[PDB]
Amino acid sequence: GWKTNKYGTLYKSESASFTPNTDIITRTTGPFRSMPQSGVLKAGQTIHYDEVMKQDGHVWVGYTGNSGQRIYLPVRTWNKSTNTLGVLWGTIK
Numbered sequence: 151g152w153k154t155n156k157y158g159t160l161y162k163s164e165s166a167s168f169t170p171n172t173d174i175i176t177r178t179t180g181p182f183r184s185m186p187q188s189g190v191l192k193a194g195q196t197i198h199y200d201e202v203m204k205q206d207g208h209v210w211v212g213y214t215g216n217s218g219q220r221i222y223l224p225v226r227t228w229n230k231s232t233n234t235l236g237v238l239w240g241t242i243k
C-alpha cells in the first residue's frame with residue numbers, strides 16, 4: 151500500500167532503475183520544488199532508486215547521491231484530489 155510521514159508525504163520502499171527522456175531538476179532534503187536544487191539528472195542518465203514518494207503534485211523517487219546525501223527526483227505529475235498520474239518522464243527498468 152503506502153505510508154504517510156510527519157509532512158503528509160505518501161511513501162514506500164521500491165528498488166528499480168529510472169532513465170529520464172528529458173533533463174529533470176533533482177532536490178535535496180525532501181520531495182518539494184521549494185527544496186534546494188541538488189542538481190539536474192540529464193536525459194538518458196540511468197539512476198537506481200530505493201524509495202518512491204507522492205507529494206507536491208508529483209511522484210518522486212529517492213536515492214543516495216555521491217556525498218551520502220538523499221536526492222529527490224520528480225518523474226511524473228500527480229493530482230492527489232484524483233490520484234491521477236501524468237506521463238512518466240522516462241522508463242523504469
Ligand SMILES: C[C@H](N)C(=O)N[C@H](CCC(=O)N[C@@H](CCCCNC(=O)CNC(=O)CNC(=O)CNC(=O)CNC(=O)CN)C(=O)N[C@H](C)C(=O)O)C(N)=O
Nearest residue numbers: 154155156157158159160161162179180181182201203212
Ligand atoms: C501528523 C500530521 N501529518 C501533521 O499535522 N504534521 C505536522 C508537521 C509540521 C512540521 O513538521 N512542520 C515543519 C516545517 C514544515 C515546512 C518545511 N518542510 C519540510 O521540512 C519538509 N521536510 C521533509 O520533507 C523531510 N524529508 C523527508 O521526509 C524525506 N523522506 C520522505 O519524503 C519520505 N520518506 C520517509 O519519510 C522515510 N521514513 C517544522 O515545524 N519544522 C521544525 C524546524 C521542527 O521540526 O521543529 C505537525 N503539526 O506535526
